[PDB]
Design a protein around this ligand. Structure first.
Ligand SMILES: C[S@+](CC[C@H](N)C(=O)[O-])C[C@H]1O[C@@H](n2cnc3c(N)ncnc32)[C@H](O)[C@@H]1O
Ligand SMILES: C[S@+](CC[C@H](N)C(=O)[O-])C[C@H]1O[C@@H](n2cnc3c(N)ncnc32)[C@H](O)[C@@H]1O
Lengths: 213, 213
């Protein structure tokens, strides 16, 4: 995965910031009540770190559950959008998550629709930084798109193309990372990295994960 | 879709023909009884045409249900393997299905796991020839892989990846066409081309279609 794909994906979200909520993540609206049952399970409490907060759709929920939220995003434009919710207990910080080392620790870490934008060759290092961010007794939780277990094997592709072309309505076009991972695949891969994981398809096409370091 | 992908796909199966039954189609063995409930619904009868017969897994069944089977495959190697079943009422013919205009008509046309190897730019001409091959009162039935209705939109790719990369036993690597199409997508496209279609997911990961001209 070339650095061009990382930058073109960032630039994409930097440019999509104005119009983002006009479209949102496809069918996330269908899946939100199922994901919310997991989000409110009680692990999102105290000092909470959110990764890739975007326009702050999840940040609102976390704000309601946490004492304080630290919300990180690569796009200052996303941050400005998120500011319009006026959430008293949220601090925003701009941060390239592919070049990030936490300095403190938090009770819980959350991200929605971020991991699928992390290519396999960046997976492990992202997850090492996530590890250091988790306070003792803390949890990592995330939401993402998913596949049924067997699709990967039916497809049987030895060089999966991670890239997807997206095009705004102004006409400028971008390639982004889009890696659909099954609950089984993420569990295998994060177990190998030392996490204990409960990863579940909560609604067709969507997963929710709880990971303990 | 370049002619080189088409050729690569056919050479992949030519080379695979001797070891094909050793791996077969992933999870088809799980889905076979469900698919058989449809195959045995009574439309496979009289003179049937089979497209992309391979090693004759389905030809065996077609042979038991029909009077006569004409089985077409691009690979003589595949045809040689299929001959080992010693089916009395079956005639094999080598035929490149992307360069094919039937001269005869049949009571039924069947194919299993062929349509997913027909790229979008070849789909219409393929169905045009299939239309020529169906006798009045006849049907086309087919088995293939499937996706959940919503995946396509969740991915949201404007240049969808038509291709996957396979590796043989001996290490030889080949790109092939692998287009997963939902029942609704297939129904909508085939209806636009004048077919009435009953397309159903009969087992997770697998669909069965009955199409009428
Ligand atoms: C649409 S997805 C996240 C969805 C939305 N932010 C949410 O949490 O529901 C992309 C988000 O990740 C952010 N992002 C993309 N590349 C990044 C990077 N390299 N470093 C940090 N954030 C990045 C984008 O700014 C965008 O907000
Ligand atoms: C994975 S399938 C095998 C079929 C298997 N017997 C079945 O029906 O379940 C692909 C089959 O299509 C054939 N094929 C690939 N390209 C072709 C082409 N251009 N024309 C005719 N047959 C082709 C291959 O020879 C192979 O037998």
């Amino acid at each position: 995965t070339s650095h061009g794909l990382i930058e073109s994906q960032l630039s994409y979200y930097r440019a999509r910031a104005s119009e983002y909520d006009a479209t949102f993540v496809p069918y996330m609206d269908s899946a939100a009540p199922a994901a919310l049952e997991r989000l409110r399970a009680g692990n999102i409490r105290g000092d909470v770190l959110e990764l890739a907060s975007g326009t702050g759709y999840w940040t609102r929920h976390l704000s309601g559950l946490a004492d304080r939220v630290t919300a990180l995003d690569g796009s200052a434009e996303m941050i400005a959008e998120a500011g319009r919710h006026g959430l008293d207990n949220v601090e925003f910080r701009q941060q390239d998550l592919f070049d990030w080392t936490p300095d403190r620790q938090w009770d819980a870490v959350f991200f929605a629709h971020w991991l699928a934008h992390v290519p396999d060759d960046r997976f492990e290092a992202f997850w090492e930084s996530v590890r250091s961010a988790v306070a003792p007794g803390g949890v990592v939780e995330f939401v993402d798109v998913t596949d049924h277990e067997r699709r990967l094997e039916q497809q049987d592709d030895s060089e999966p193309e991670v890239a997807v072309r997206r095009t705004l309505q102004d006409g400028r076009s971008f390639r982004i990372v889009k890696v659909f991972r099954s609950p089984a695949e993420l569990t295998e891969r994060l177990t190998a990295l030392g996490w204990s994981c409960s990863v579940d398809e909560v609604h067709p096409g969507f997963l929710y994960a709880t990971c303990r370091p």
